[PDB]
A paper describes a structure:
The superimposed structures reveal that the mutants crystallized in the pre-power-stroke state adopting the same overall conformation as previously reported for the wildtype. Characteristic features of this pre-power-stroke state are the partially open actin-binding cleft, the up position of the converter, and the relay helix in a bent conformation. The nucleotide position and nucleotide-binding pocket are conserved between wild-type and mutants. Only minor structural deviations from the wild-type conformation can be observed for the mutants concerning the β3, β5, and β7 strands of the central transducer, which are slightly shifted, as well as the relay helix conformation.
With the aid of mutant analyses based on kinetic investigations and simulations, we identified the W-helix as an important hub coupling the structural changes of switch elements during ATP hydrolysis to temporally controlled interactions with actin that are passed to the central transducer and converter. A critical role in controlling the sequence of events associated with force production appears to be played by the W-helix, which we propose to act as kind of communication zone in the inner myosin core for coupling conformational rearrangements upon nucleotide binding to cleft closure-induced β-sheet distortions by putting a stress on β1 to β3 of the central transducer; this is important to temporally couple weak-to-strong actin-binding transitions to the initiation of the power stroke and release of hydrolysis products.
Author numbering: 1 to 203, 208 to 701, 712 to 716, 719 to 730, 735 to 748
Write the structure that this text describes.
Amino acid sequence: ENPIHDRTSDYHKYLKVKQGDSDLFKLTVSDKRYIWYNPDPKERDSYECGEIVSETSDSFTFKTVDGQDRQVKKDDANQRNPIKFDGVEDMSELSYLNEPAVFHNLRVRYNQDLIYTYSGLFLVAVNPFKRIPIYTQEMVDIFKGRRRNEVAPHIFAISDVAYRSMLDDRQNQSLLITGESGAGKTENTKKVIQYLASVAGRNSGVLEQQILQANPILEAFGNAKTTRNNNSSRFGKFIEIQFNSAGFISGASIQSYLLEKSRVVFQSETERNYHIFYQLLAGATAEEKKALHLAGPESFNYLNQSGCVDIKGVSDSEEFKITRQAMDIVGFSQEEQMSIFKIIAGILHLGNIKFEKGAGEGAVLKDKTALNAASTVFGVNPSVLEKALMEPRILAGRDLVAQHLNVEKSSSSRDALVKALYGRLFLWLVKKINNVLCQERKAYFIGVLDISGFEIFKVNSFEQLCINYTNEKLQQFFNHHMFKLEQEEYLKEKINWTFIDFGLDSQATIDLIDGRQPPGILALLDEQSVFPNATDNTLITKLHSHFSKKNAKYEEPRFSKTEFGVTHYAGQVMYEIQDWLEKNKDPLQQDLELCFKDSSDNVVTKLFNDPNIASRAKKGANFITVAAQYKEQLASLMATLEAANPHFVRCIIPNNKQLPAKLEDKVVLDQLRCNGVLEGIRITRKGFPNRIIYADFVPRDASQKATDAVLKHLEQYRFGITKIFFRA
Ligand SMILES: [Mg+2]
């Protein structure tokens, strides 16, 4: 408690509000009252401060920056909290709770690099887009074991609360970090793992280092630069840190989700492919480059299409050293790593294969430099691969028929092979890692969820619907645990609570997407995926007839025939239907699988012969679809979190330019609205947060009134059947 109460410490310098000056005290003592108003009535999110000069029984009259006088009815007034509240660590304490006031406090805090603020029971994290030194080992030690009230808001603080609640209650916990693309999820995820790895680690603790080095691996193959984030996680993950009864870390398990493997073969302008492609070409030795027939990223069709090969302030050559070091710590062998880079080098070669029209409408390959280079590194027969690309054999009834695919379909099958290769390598990486950390049968666990977030682009596809649908369910889980389950408890225990509707329900949008009866978008997509004469247009035509003018969350646009709109909690998203059928089916010519099953490389062969990696579950006579499969594993995850005690962290992006020291009014407030932040504060103030059973609620044995005496010795708090609740 030396540095907590020492103004000289880095703690107070970087985690506490700076001491106000002589002049600020004179304003903190003022009797004047102020108000938040909109100078431009229809610019609803930009406010200014004004002094209240007079009031009637129902109205305030205040002054504008210009000097004019404006009038507002008290029922519609956003009063400004006294400035003594400016910078408060928990905004439950604010007297007036309105949008401009909540944003104001955060602003006051953001201006001094105070990115963490509590909103009742959950935490708010505003991305600084700059490195601030509050994640050192010294800071870890300060927060170790401290109550939430005793120290300042911090990701370590709520991580510690989950750890203590795990041991006190003997139950599993979850740390759910929400936010849109670029808001701060993965960065805060890393800190949660850091803190838990330290306060619960063993002081020969190599397991703990191994857990820390597992994420740098997945980021190199799993993250990429998008228009909204230079280190965008193109996959979701549930990280399950495991402990023993004693409370020390016993193991860990990663469950990956929804890899955007369509990115390996296509990227929008200014976007990049997965980091690892640029780390190899930039950090590979001359020996390696010569062995894998490599060149610069400008020479590969999968990397020379968006116009961008760099990320500002990132050395791909240097990042390559980090992932190789991380693979050493986790225990990948030298030949494993070399086989991994063969697959990456081979994928890039496959991308430069150009099919051209032959004598007939079928395709031909006049230049086989890329084909041979790929076959070389993979260890497969090139002419077998060649026939498997352009001439795959299928069954027609029972006859064995050989196709002759045109240029278009030959390139698509080549892309299918690439995406299959990369997607299976990723599951392999996660699988090898999970096995190195599968060393003890857990007693409890603290689950950390780090998903891809809400994202909108000029062109949104099946991948964006799955991402945004996942973010819609997480927001509903926040709504569920904060408002419905909360009041249901109050109602059940009969403490005379009048139900409140907070107006936060994403169920209509969720049913529209994943509903079975009536069928939703994914159900109709699955239905068309197996219908043999279905097209991308017969699909959206089907979606319009089912939901246009029928479901209030669905819009058939008048300006386009291949797009449809879904109204999410974070906003309407228009989705392009192109390629949805083939993306849901995820086809791959089996002749291509056969060719790689005969591969020289040990890794490649396990990617195509290991049943857990290479098989696909069958739904009758058809393979299970991407939609149906992801739905199953999403339901399993949400079942895991409903059984665990949730701790929420709401990440907020300050602007859409990835810049520091720039907190934009209307970008922040929209996230505060759709996240339900203020609703989450009101329920904690109006409501009663915790309840302990009567028996455990000073003669220490007994009658529900036994516990009444203690408070007497020490309306405000109420009694219910079987439990006792507290307020504030
Ligand atoms: Mg991320």
